[PDB]
Structure formats: C-alpha cells, structure tokens
Design a protein around this ligand. Structure first.
Ligand SMILES: OC[C@H]1O[C@H](O[C@H]2[C@H](O)[C@@H](O)[C@@H](O)O[C@@H]2CO)[C@H](O)[C@@H](O)[C@@H]1O
Ligand SMILES: OC[C@H]1O[C@H](O[C@H]2[C@H](O)[C@@H](O)[C@@H](O)O[C@@H]2CO)[C@H](O)[C@@H](O)[C@@H]1O
Ligand SMILES: *[C@@H]1O[C@H](CO)[C@@H](O)[C@H](O)[C@H]1NC(C)=O
Ligand SMILES: *[C@@H]1O[C@H](CO)[C@@H](O)[C@H](O)[C@H]1NC(C)=O
Ligand SMILES: *[C@@H]1O[C@H](CO)[C@@H](O)[C@H](O)[C@H]1NC(C)=O
Ligand SMILES: [Zn+2]
Ligand SMILES: [Zn+2]
Lengths: 693, 663
C-alpha cells in the first residue's frame, strides 16, 4: 500500500508565497516529493512586496495557503486573524528549539511554523583582506587605502533599515522597550544617543565617499561578487551567489562600534497558514512531514543557505559549518524581533529617517525625531519612498519630499510597461512636482497625449499610447519575426519655465502572428492539414505564402506570381491543443514541376529539417523553435528550368518534453531522408513567372 | 594508351604545397603516375606555416602551382586574387557532394577543388574501456582514477584553437553568425556564456593537473600511441600513426558539455590553383583525372587517412569503416568553417584567447572580450529603450550609441539578480540586451496581479563601473498579460466552482468546471460556498473543461438556467441559454463563448431575470461537441425558443446559492 490512497481524487491544492531571495527551487523539489507521494500539486510564487500584499488579499479571503517571512510581520496578521492557528503534537514541537517557537507565538497562540534563524553577518574577500576590520572606526582607513587600489572597503544595502539597524543599535538604540514581559509602544528608543551615534557614523561614512547613498542590495551584491569591494554585510541567503562566484570569501562577526557590538535584529524565517485556506490539513502535512526534516531543509539549504535552522536534528549537524556559527555568534549579539504589529510601522519610520539623513534632506536629530514620532503610526506605511510622513496635532499624513537632487541623468530613470494592446511610460510624481509641475507633466511625439497622475499607483505619473501606428505619433517597425511599436517621451520645460533637455525613446516589441495576417486577408492562398493526436487530440497545420519579408500581406487567389529575382516568403502555423507542448517543425520542403507532391522530380528547399544548401537562395528564419515556422526562397533562381512550380511541405509535431526539436545543421547532407509521409504534406501552387510588367 | 596523343614534347613543372600531417607520399605517387602518363614532373613539399607562407610568395608572382589546405583560408586568398577560378563540367561537379562545392565557392566563383572533409573525433582505447565517457564533466573523475596509475585520462593539443574549439562551441558558441544566407562579420559569438563555460572548464581542467597546459600535438600523439594516455581528440590524419602502433583503438563522438554536443569546426581539405601559374590546365587535369578517383584517393588514404572524402564513389565504400563514420557523426554535430577572409583574423584572435586563459595571463572574460573586439560629444541627453515581451520570455534592450552619447566609457548592466548580465545584441540596430523568463523569481523578476491582469516586472541596473560612481541608472520594465479564466480559477484560494468528472474513451480522466466571476474579463472569481449580488449586478459565468487534451472537442452549453430552489429538477426554471441559444436579445444576457472552444463564457443580470425570488441556483448542461464537422458553434436567429426542453441531469453542473443583496 501507498500514501497516495488518502489524498486520491483530490480537488485540493497548495499555493506558497516566499521571497525570491531564499531558495525557491529546493522548496519546489520538496513540493515535487510531496506531489510524488500524495499526488497533490504544489505552487511557489513570488509577488512584489508579498509581505505587504498578503494582508490585503487575505482580508478578502484569498491568497496563498502558505506565507513565508520573518516573524516580525506575522503577529500583525494574527491581530487581523489572517493566520490559522497552529497546533502540532508535542512530539513535533520538541523537534524545534523553543525560542523559535516563541518567535511565532502571538497572544498565546502559535500562528506559524518556525523554519530558520536569520542574522546579518560580515562577509569579506579572503584574497583581498586576510583579516577584516574588527571595528567600524577603522573602515575609513581601509577605504582610503583601497581607493588607491581602485576598489572600495564596504558596500551593503543602504535602502532597507534591516541592514543599517545593527550599527544604530550597537550603542543601545532600540525599537520598542521590553517591559514586564511585554512591549511598550509608547516607549521608543529611536531618538536616543546610541542611535544618533550609529547613524551619524554611517552618514559620516557616506559623506566621505566611502559608500554611496544610492547603493542597494543588487548593486552591493554585484559589486562584492566581482571582487571590487573588500566586504559587505548580509545573511546566509546571499552565500549561494558568492560560492559560484570566483571570489574566495569568508563570514565573521560584524565590526564593533564604540567598543559595543553591532546589534542586528534577528529574524526567524517562518511559515504561516492562511486562515481562509480550505487546504490547511495538507499545508500542515506538507510543512510538518516534509518541509521540516533533515532531507527537506537539506534541499532548501542546498539551493540557498537558510542559516541556522529551527530543527534540532539538522541544526546540530549544520552548526559544524563556520559560517552559520558566525551567523549565530552575530545573532546572539543582536536581539530577536518583536512579532507585534507596530514593527510594520517601525521599519517604515526608520527607512524614511535613514535615507533623509543620508541624502542630507534632514539632520540625524530631525530625522530621528520624525522617526520616533512616526514609529507606531500605521498611516506612515501608506507613504512611498519619495514621500515624507508628517505628523500634525490631530493626525499623520503623507507628503511629497520637498527637495530632490536631480542629475540630467536622474530624469531618465523611468518605468516602461508593454501591455498587449497598449504601452505605458511612468515617472516619479514627487520628483516632478518638486520642479513646479501642477499639470501637463509630460507628452509624447504628439503633444496632445499628455501625463496624468496614475490611477493605480499614486507614486507614478504616467503616459499611455496604444501600440499601433499613428495614434500619439507611435511608429511601427517590422522584421520577419516581430512588430516593434516605438515612440519618444518629451518632458515639458514650459510650465516650469526652466530648461534642462531630456527625451526618452521607448519601444514595445511583440511577436508577429501570421494567422492574424491570414484572417485579415479577404481570400488568402493557404493550405490546411488536420492532424489527429491520440484519442482526444486534434491539431491543424496551415501553410501560406507572403508578399513581404515581414511575413505579412499574404498572396490572394489560386496562383502566385514571382519576378526572376523575387523571394517567396513561406510560413506555417499550428493550431489546436497546447501550442506549448508541441513545436511546429518543417521536415522536408520542396518544389515540383508538376502539381503532384509525389513527382519524381523534387527540388529540396529543406531536407531532413535543414536547408538543402547555404546559398542565399534559401533562408530559414524559424523551424522547430515554436508554434510557427518561416522560411524564404528565391524560387525561380533556385529552380529555373520551369515557367511554374508547385510547393510542398512535410510537417511534424515535435514534443518538446521528450525530444529537442530545433535542428542542428552542419552543412553536410545525407540524402537518406527521401522518405516522405504524404499525409503530413501541405501543398500550394502554382507558382508562376510574371512574363509581363 | 591513346592518351599519349594529347601530351607530346612536354614542358614545365608542377609544384604543390600541402601540410605534412596528411599523406605526402600518396599525393607524390599520384604525381609520379601523372608524370608517367604526361611526362611532366610534379614536386610535393610541406613547408612550416605553409598557409601563412603561401600569400607572401604568391604576391610576387612566385610560389607553388597548387596549394592544399582547409577551405576557411582560401577566401582570404581569393579576395587577394591569388587563386584562379576553377570551372569543371557539371558532369564532374555531380561527382562530389554539393556542400563541399559550397565551401569552396566565394562571391559566386569556385576558387578551389574539394578533396576531403575533416572533423575532429574522439579517439579512445577500445581494449582499455568498453565505453568512453559521454560528457566533459566526468573526465576529472576518470583522470583522478587514472592519476593513481601514474598516467592521465585525456591529452590533446591546447595550442591550436581548432582542437579546443568544440568545447567552446559546444554550448551556444560561434565564430560568425550565419544570417540571410551569408556570414556576418560584425556579429561575433566569442564573448557569450557557453564559450566562457567551455574555456573556463578547460582552465579548470588544466588547473587540476588532469592535463598539462603545455600539451601539444606531438605530446598527445606520442603519449597516446605509447599508452600513457587512455584517450585523445583528433582528426583522421593522426590515425595513421595509431594503426602501426600495437595499441588497439576506436573512434567515436566527442563528449557532451552542459548537455549539449561538441560542435567541432568542420574543415574541407581543398586544393587551390595559383593564379600566376601558366600550367593551370595541367594542374586541372592532375586534380580531376588522377587525384580525385577511387584509385587516386586509395593511395593517399592508404598512406594516411583523409577522413570522409568529398568524392561520392570513394566515400560510398569508405563509410563502411566506423572511424570515418564517427568523423561524419562529429561533423554533423558541428558547423563548417566559413570561407570568408576574416577567418584569417578570427583564428589569430581565438588562439590568443586560448593560451592567455590557460596560462592565467588573463581572465576568460578579458580574453574572449579582446578576441571578440579583434574579430571586428554630448549636447542633448536621451536614452533608447526597447522591451520585448514574448510568451515564455522577456528581453530588455538599450542602444549603445546613446549610452556612449550619455558618457558611458564601458557598459555594465544587470537585473535585480546580478547574475543576469547584459550581452551584445545584433539587430537592425546594435543593442545591449538582457533576457529573462516571463515568469516570477528567476533573475529577481516579480509578479504583480490585479483582477484583470498578471504583470511581470523587473529592474534593470545600468552603470559605468562595478564600483558605483555618482552616475548610475536604474530602469524598471514590465510585461503585463491578461489573465486566463482557467488560471484565474486555479490561482484562487477558495473559489466558488462546481466540477463534473468525465471519462472519454474509457481512457484517462477529465473534468468540466463551472465558476462565477466578478469581472467582465471573466477573472477574479467569487470566493466561498455562496455568492451575493445586488439587484442590478451582473453574474459572469464561465465553464471550462480540464485535465488533459480535449482539442478535438469544443465545449458546448446546451441549456443554462436558474431555479429558485437548489433542485436542478425544479419545475420553475428561468432559462438563460435554451436550445444552445441565448434566451433574450438584450444586454441582460450576453453569451460570449459557446461551442467555440475548451471554454465557454456568458453573463447574466440575475435578479431582473429571476424576478420575485431573492435567491437562485444556477444550472448548466454541458456536452463535448466534436468539431470535425465544424457545426459546433451554434447559430441563433431569434429570441423565440420552444418552452419544452429536454435536459440530461447527469451532464448538468450546479452552483449556489446565489442570494440577493439586502435580504
Ligand atoms: O528592512 C525592513 C524589513 O526588514 C526585515 O526584512 C528582512 C528579512 O528579515 C530578511 O529575511 C531578508 O529577507 O531581508 C529583509 C529586508 O530586505 C523585516 O522582516 C521586514 O518586516 C522589514 O520590512
Ligand atoms: O588552429 C587554427 C587553424 O585551424 C585550421 O587548420 C586546421 C585544419 O583545418 C585541419 O585540417 C588540421 O589538420 O590542421 C589544422 C589544425 O588547426 C584552419 O584551416 C587554419 O587556418 C587555422 O590556422
Ligand atoms: C545631491 O544628491 C545626492 C543624492 O541624493 C546628495 O548628495 C544630496 O541629496 C544632494 N546634495 C546635497 C549637498 O544635499
Ligand atoms: C526582430 O526584431 C526583434 C526586436 O524588434 C528582435 O527581438 C528579434 O530577434 C528580431 N528577429 C530576428 C530574426 O532577428
Ligand atoms: C490591471 O493592471 C494592468 C497592468 O498594467 C492594467 O493594464 C489594467 O488596466 C489593470 N486593470 C484594472 C481593472 O485596474
Ligand atoms: Zn498524507
Ligand atoms: Zn591529359
């Protein structure tokens, strides 16, 4: 007997959200194992701002069955009843460390499964520095030293407060005072001396050009991984990218500040179950039986490291690695995050205060003051990066930052969205509003198509144009495969009455569908072949001839006529079933002097999936790659004896799962493939010479 | 015998240059037979760097009458007009394979005679191992195993790029892109990922002491023939030395790299005629009558193997040997060398990249970059950005010249994942492009859904230096697609849906689903076990078949109706679709899709329809309609239908309750 019996005839499913920076593939593999055993499928998807999006959808009774995050968010969900209560047997609970269970406990109830323990650690290049700086104060020396070598000392994400927090709290800065076994929200440690010291040091570092304020995760990763930075600050999940990198690296404790250790907020990677989920039992089985296991966490950790796991058995072995040991050493120096809801607001309040102090929009005192005032305020979560959250006597509100520093380049930063029938270009609203823009922010080649405040995203100001030639001065450009719709975005120096000239040429390229070209034609010349697949499958292959190199504007009527130098553009299309499963392959294409496809005289354009020769007389654009295929032939230059010829194409449906369809053509011919299945042949003709202007 | 008439009182001589690794003796023997018949002397010499030496002497109106080499060089000579045009009869051309003639063709003219087809093959001791390693990745293991015996696994010449090329080209590597029937010289495939993979693997091989970077032809041949190496990689011309050796050997296909086959550059051994020679006629007779023949090639091939010959007659018999067959198999995997002149410059650029990466003088990136380069201010500030949204992929492209105009000395761009890096993109314009799948989570791509649409977005970082300066730019790009009904239904956590299992042919299992949707796009399905509607609200219903390929069938909804009770058999029915057609001609009912596809879709204003009752249940009878007769999609002329309707309850899907807003 098998496990599969209990879940048989399941209409149930399992949907998982996790941040893409952790290993999704290992989790997916565990999903494949779960699918193997139980016969139930498991999906893993990464939405933008998933921790923020989850509550929104979850409120409506929709979302993933499982959500992965650091515990600090979870209690915020629990307060809203978005998380189903976990109630595992003691035997199971005993397998994980109690503090990891404490992290996920909220208001007495377990709202999630602890997975792993996350703490920021100091990552450095072993080749570049043998001994890393043990303190923060000695880094500027290193940077000044390394600046001569054409490199930098330290680069790490400055955009997320998670990364800058440890230095701030190093001297005793804190989020929410823990008192009488409970967190006090009206007691906030943001504006004290230690925070100011840490942040002042950070600002003083970036002011000295030791680090750029524009630096983010991606940039720092890229910089460090190319060995152009001596060290960075990060968690286990990064390591996977460094291993593959030629960089020889090491992980140790963060540097001290004022003789005090860096105090990182320690996260617990945790898996919550949606309260709306019908699948809760399956989720519990999956998480308990499969996800948390030596093998499972081995897999996930193998894709990307988890750091210190909550599972005792695997951890006891996993600690043997020095890096996670360093991660623990760091964690023990810092403090585990509160799971309370306010943490959502806190993080937002710091981020605003760090970037303002870094950009120089405010002093550390002013920034931290605003921060402390906004620490528990939930409204401030609604504010974008470029917005200040301002506190009135009555209530908090969002406001655009009053001052931006804009290079002639900064204006070129933009969002380009290519939709199916339309194109949209978007630019930051505040950066524009800063310059005195009330309205009519921007326009395209046609000045009548103007900017509007984006109805979806308050942050953006957007311009839209259909993707077709002639509205809003949009322009179409075709090549054999694709149709590219392009336009230019002008910025208006008028309303602001100040001149800095920039324009952005943007374009959306879409694949060309010849079936549309055929449907557009009143009476196109086309041959069709129905192909039955198995009991229930049915497919259709069509072959048609086109007047243009774009493979558009097909010939109409019962005959085609060519100039001596003319190119015939042939194309083939597949319909029915999954166009993904099968790829359209043209196995043998040839011409005959007669109408019979069985003609003893065959002139092969394509033979054995490959061109008959390398001459320009035959050009094959698309074969075996997709649902369509395309090739051109100069017909009467290729076969010249005859005043007309007929065209024949043998076609085969290529399963892309079990065989690779795209042919490899060496330019050496066997001529052993002369066997043709006439049931698979499409025929078109006659193809005649003009003989008249 | 009677040939003697056309040659009497003979004069002049014939001088031939050919590489010494091929049979010099056989060619000379044929030359001596030619001398016997014609009474004209023929000299055969093998100079050092003969291919480089030929143009030098040829420029002065001095040199050999005939030159033997791979075709890739010849177009370089032809461009210099050092080669006389050959004009053999069709009857003769039919005797050799056309592609061999295509190789020797340049700018429309045939500049030389094809002799043989050469491709690198994997030579191994058949006695030593029954089956050779099928991949490159497993070689270090074999070597480590063989390291205990005081020997090595694989040794071959690393000095000539010709021998190392296949691994480089195994994964997506290429010299010159073949487009519109001609080779593109400004389109170069040297700096791509696969080449880097292969060459990096090679460096990693020599770094592990599995093979010495100093290894050359002599060393590998001498070593393998003496049994100090288990296997090597080489062409036919080497075999002659292995045959005499007591070693029992075999020849097979090169090992795969990254799941893809090795693509050796396939050479065509070819004989060109000097343009300065008055003796061209004699050269032509020599090449046509004697050199290319069963008897002629027999001598040369018997002396040393030519591999697969261009001559049909001799090849047809010669294929029966497994070695040349393996050589053919290898040839079929790779691609023939372009005949263009630039190849002369190419080989020089790669050779530098092979030795520099091996010795450790440069990184693979630097070497391949330099090679690729060798192969081929600001007033207003503007940028060129092109986004291509494919079905399975996205490509983002930025124009080079604009980046230069914007003051970028060098271009580094990448996505959220720094592992995804830009490459040089050749189109109607020269671009720098990055590619990513259109699904979320590779390359740090992220999904954003709204009720109607699934939007896949990512950020493109663009900067001059890896260490970031004051100038760095980032560009957010996104591809938004409409949501599929099935997908919308499958994505939903707890959608309201009714399902019916169907068997077809008694084989396999399929199902039919009916579900309710909040949007006119038929997306954003209702959640829960019940739906509640305003009096004026529109219920968007859809029905789809799932669980495998039903493509031969179109989903047809014959009768769809509402009942005040939960019973589908209720005598009181309000018909939305009756006799396959919409009950009313009004905006109150719209049937979007019926009998057309695997899906069906319709909207109804439910409570103007149901009237007096504050709740209803929805019922849809469904059938698989065979589309072969093309009668499936129903035609509705008028709103008048028979009240009597025959319904099979086994095919009816039921959903409810559907309740009115405000009690
Ligand atoms: O910086 C604010 C952010 O910090 C934490 O998120 C971390 C997370 O702990 C790590 O697992 C890793 O993924 O990096 C994240 C930040 O980039 C908090 O969990 C989160 O609520 C908070 O917004
Ligand atoms: O390595 C560069 C070199 O490769 C080719 O020459 C080959 C030749 O094609 C083979 O037949 C073999 O036997 O000898 C050479 C080994 O490299 C190119 O034809 C030549 O121009 C180039 O220098
Ligand atoms: C110029 O912009 C940068 C980055 O924002 C920063 O130095 C600051 O915002 C501006 N300069 C000053 C002196 O404030
Ligand atoms: C056609 O142009 C598009 C961009 O406009 C490009 O992505 C595609 O590769 C081009 N087709 C070919 C065959 O090069
Ligand atoms: C959903 O988002 C897409 C992505 O741009 C947009 O095109 C569409 O208009 C949006 N639909 C609604 C109903 O907001
Ligand atoms: Zn089970
Ligand atoms: Zn003669």
């Amino acid at each position: 007997g098998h496990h599969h019996h209990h879940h048989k005839t399941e209409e149930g499913k399992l949907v998982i959200w996790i941040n893409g920076d952790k290993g999704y593939n290992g989790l997916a593999e565990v999903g494949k194992k779960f699918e193997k055993d139980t016969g139930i499928k498991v999906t893993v998807e990464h939405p933008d701002k998933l921790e923020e999006k989850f509550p929104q959808v979850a409120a409506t009774g929709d979302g993933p069955d499982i959500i992965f995050w650091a515990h600090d968010r979870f209690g915020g969900y629990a307060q809203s009843g978005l998380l189903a209560e976990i109630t595992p047997a003691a035997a199971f609970q005993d397998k994980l460390y109690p503090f990891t269970w404490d992290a996920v406990r909220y208001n007495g109830k377990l709202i999630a499964y602890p997975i792993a323990v996350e703490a920021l650690s100091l990552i450095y290049n072993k080749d570049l520095l043998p001994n890393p700086p043990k303190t923060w104060e000695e880094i500027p020396a290193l940077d000044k030293e390394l600046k001569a070598k054409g490199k930098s000392a330290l680069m790490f994400n400055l955009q997320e407060p998670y990364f800058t927090w440890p230095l701030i709290a190093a001297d005793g800065g804190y989020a929410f005072k823990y008192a009488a076994g409970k967190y006090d929200i009206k007691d906030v440690g943001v504006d004290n001396a230690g925070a100011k010291a840490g942040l002042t040091f950070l600002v003083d570092l970036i002011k000295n050009k030791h680090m750029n304020a524009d630096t983010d995760y991606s940039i720092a990763e890229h910089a460090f991984n190319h060995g152009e930075t001596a060290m960075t600050i990060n968690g286990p999940w990064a390591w996977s990218n460094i291993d593959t990198s030629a960089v020889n690296y090491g992980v140790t404790v963060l540097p001290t500040f004022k003789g005090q250790p860096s105090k990182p907020f320690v996260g617990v990677l945790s898996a919550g179950i949606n309260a709306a989920s019908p699948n809760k039992e399956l989720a519990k089985e999956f998480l308990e039986n499969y996800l948390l296991t030596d093998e499972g966490l081995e897999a996930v950790n193998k894709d990307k490291p988890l750091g210190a796991v909550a599972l005792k058995s695997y951890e006891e072995e996993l600690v043997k690695d020095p890096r996670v040991a360093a991660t623990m050493e760091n964690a023990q120096k810092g403090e585990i995050m509160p799971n309370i809801p306010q943490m959502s607001a806190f993080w937002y309040a710091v981020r605003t205060a760090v970037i303002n102090a870094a950009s120089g929009r405010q002093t550390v005192d002013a920034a931290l003051a605003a921060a402390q005032t906004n620490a528990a305020a939930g409204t401030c979560e609604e504010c974008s990066i470029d917005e200040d959250c301002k506190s009135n006597n009555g209530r908090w509100h969002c406001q655009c930052k009053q001052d931006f520093n804009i290079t002639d380049i900064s204006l070129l930063e933009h969002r380009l969205e290519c939709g199916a029938n339309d194109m949209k270009v978007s630019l930051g609203k505040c950066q524009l509003k800063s310059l005195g823009f009330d309205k009519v922010f921007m326009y395209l080649s046609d000045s009548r198509c103007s900017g509007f405040n984006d109805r979806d995203n308050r942050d953006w100001v957007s311009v839209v144009t259909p993707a077709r030639d002639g509205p809003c001065g949009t322009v179409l450009t075709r090549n054999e495969t694709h149709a590219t719709y392009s336009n230019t975005l002008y910025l208006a120096d008028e309303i602001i009455i100040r001149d800095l000239n920039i324009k952005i040429n943007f374009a959306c390229s879409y694949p060309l569908d010849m079936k549309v070209s055929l449907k557009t034609a009143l009476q196109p010349m086309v041959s069709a072949l129905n192909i039955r697949v198995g009991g229930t499958g049915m497919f259709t292959v069509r072959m048609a001839l086109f007047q243009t190199p774009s493979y558009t504007q097909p010939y109409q009527g019962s005959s085609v006529t060519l100039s001596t130098e003319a190119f015939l553009y042939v194309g083939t299309m597949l319909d029915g079933g999954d166009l993904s499963r099968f790829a359209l392959l043209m196995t043998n294409c040839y011409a005959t002097p007669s109408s019979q496809a069985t003609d003893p005289l065959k002139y092969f354009i394509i033979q054995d999936r490959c061109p008959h020769t390398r001459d320009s007389t035959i050009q094959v654009v698309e074969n075996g790659e997709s649902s369509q295929g395309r090739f051109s032939v100069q017909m009467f230059r290729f076969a010249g004896n005859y005043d007309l010829v007929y065209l024949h194409c043998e076609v085969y449906l290529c399963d892309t799962m079990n065989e690779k369809c795209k042919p490899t053509c060496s330019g050496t011919a066997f001529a052993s493939g002369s066997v043709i299945d006439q049931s698979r042949v499409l025929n078109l003709g006659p193809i005649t010479r003009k003989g008249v202007q």
